[PDB]
């Protein structure tokens, strides 16, 4: 911060070697995930008995949802939706059911209510997405359709991620029921859906997608195309969602047939295995350092 400099040596900035290109190395899978099959099933189970499906070992495309329907509610919590198309996951859990239109607000972590406490409960650390779209046209009857039921009573609360199917008479009085008349009710009540019903009471189809990370090597990701492999150059690399920048070289490490990564004392990644061709690659950071300027006086 001066226009004149005295004689000496000064440390000014830092230098770093820039990357040249980008490398993407995904495993070769062409199988498509049954997202379409899970949808448009022409029959969804009730809220008190919600359908659960496991999705793994396929290529996940989320444009099918985009062309599916104009969803009334589409909320993602742990991940931004727009970035869903380039992530890798271990496995996916899809839970499908049908509820009332106005009950969609109750489907969220840290939420209370009739449905949120008696039919479905989400964990506090939920990582996934929730989709809710209207189904008045397909799940309504002129006389009234009662195929869908919801639970109204329970002895205690519900933990996240469990399903209750036991059917019994709920007790409200002190004396044991052994009957129906005196202060004893039925927790399950049938939904009443009619076309003349307005918005907020027509049936709405709800699908909850649950992901997880920090697990076995990822399986559900194939929406992006792979590239070639280069060595001895500063490059950006992406192996099954593990991203970084550096130089990849041949490695002489005796990996046992079940490891994938490799760490050191400081606990940072230094070796990797190529998914498509089983081979050990050493990773080294690109060159960086300080810059000093040597000058006599400006006089």
């Amino acid at each position: 911060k001066s226009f004149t400099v005295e004689k000496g040596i000064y440390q000014t900035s830092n230098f770093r070697v820039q990357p040249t290109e980008s490398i993407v190395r995904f495993p070769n899978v062409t199988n498509l995930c049954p997202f379409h099959e899970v949808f448009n099933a022409t029959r969804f189970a009730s809220v008190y008995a919600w359908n659960r499906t496991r999705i793994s070992n396929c290529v996940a495309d989320y444009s099918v949802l985009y062309n599916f329907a104009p969803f009334f509610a589409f909320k993602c919590y742990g991940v931004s939706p727009t970035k869903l198309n380039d992530l890798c996951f271990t496995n996916v859990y899809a839970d499908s059911f049908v509820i009332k239109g106005n009950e969609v607000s109750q489907i969220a972590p840290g939420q209370t209510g009739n449905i949120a406490d008696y039919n479905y409960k989400l964990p506090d650390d939920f990582t996934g997405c929730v989709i809710a779209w209207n189904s008045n046209k397909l799940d309504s009857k002129h006389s009234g359709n009662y195929d869908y039921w919801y639970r109204l009573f329970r002895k205690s609360k519900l933990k996240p991620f469990e399903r209750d199917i036991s059917t019994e008479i709920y007790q409200a009085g002190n004396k044991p029921c052994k009957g129906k008349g005196p202060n004893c009710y039925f927790p399950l009540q049938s939904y009443g859906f009619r076309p003349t019903y307005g918005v907020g009471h027509q049936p709405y189809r709800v699908v909850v997608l649950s992901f997880e990370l920090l697990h076995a090597p990822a399986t559900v990701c194939g929406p992006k195309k792979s590239t070639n492999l280069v060595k001895n150059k500063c490059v950006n690399f992406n192996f099954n969602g593990l991203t970084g920048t550096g130089v990849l070289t041949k490695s002489n490490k005796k990996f046992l047939p079940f490891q994938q990564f490799g760490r050191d004392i400081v606990d940072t990644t230094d070796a990797v295995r190529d998914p498509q061709t089983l081979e050990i690659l050493d990773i080294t950071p690109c060159s960086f350092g300080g810059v000093s300027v040597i000058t006599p006086g400006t006089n």
């Binding site: 990996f255 990564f261 050191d264």
Partner: protein
């Protein structure tokens, strides 16, 4: 026709498995997980009883001529809950989470399944692979955590009769996303036909513990320290 005799014995230093899939070389690592404590008290069965599952199970056997074949897991194990079923035969291994109507005294006819269960039921998951059971000591660790059934195995040559005094690390064998609750388990035996036979195995239970593991130049675990056994081990783990 079946006689089961119980005894108690020492576990020494056995039942150590690889915690994760990360390669490490020439390093000492502190880990916290469900382990079998050193010099613990294991049960010796000699030849079925139904045993608890708790949090995890360590199983060891040394029988010959393939007397022992598979295990069954569950919580009620009769008609109301899907139950695991691992079956090992000459060519392959079956794994079924199907709902079985188990017999009062399940066993293998050797080869109809009517001796185990009357019929299957509404079930989805199934798996098949190369047989697990490949003078020889076979060690297994089973544990069920957060929607995952994990099995580690190890095969060793033995010349003695009791637990060998040595160290062996159990490499991972299989991981399955089953997602059920397990509380009891039982062993499955095969009887030629009703001829009387004999077998022997050892059972232990896992507990949460902190260990110090040693990785050599090649990424193999060669020694470990149990940090809560005695003051010297605590000092070793501190340093």
């Amino acid at each position: 026709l079946i006689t089961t005799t119980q005894s108690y014995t020492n576990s020494f230093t056995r039942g150590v498995y690889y915690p994760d899939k990360v390669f490490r070389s020439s390093v000492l690592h502190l880990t916290q997980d469900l382990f079998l404590p050193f010099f613990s008290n294991v049960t010796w069965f000699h030849a079925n009883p139904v045993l608890p599952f708790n949090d995890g199970v360590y199983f060891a056997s040394t029988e010959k001529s393939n007397i022992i074949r598979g295990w069954i897991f569950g919580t009620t194990l009769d008609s109301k809950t899907q139950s695991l079923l691992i079956v090992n035969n000459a060519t392959n291994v079956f794994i079924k989470v199907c709902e079985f109507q188990f017999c009062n005294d399940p066993f293998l006819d050797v080869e109809s399944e009517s001796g185990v269960y009357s019929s299957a039921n509404n079930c989805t998951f199934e798996y098949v692979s190369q047989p697990f059971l490949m003078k020889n000591l076979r060690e297994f660790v089973f544990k069920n955590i957060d929607g995952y059934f994990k099995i580690y195995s190890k095969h060793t040559p033995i010349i003695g009769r009791d637990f060998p005094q040595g160290f062996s690390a159990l490499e991972p064998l299989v991981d399955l996303p089953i997602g059920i609750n397990i509380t009891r388990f039982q062993t499955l035996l095969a009887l030629n036909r009703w001829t009387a036979g004999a077998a022997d195995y050892y059972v232990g239970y896992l507990q949460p513990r902190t260990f110090l593991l040693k990785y050599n130049e090649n990424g193999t675990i060669t020694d470990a320290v149990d940090c809560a056994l005695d003051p010297l081990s605590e000092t070793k783990c501190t340093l």
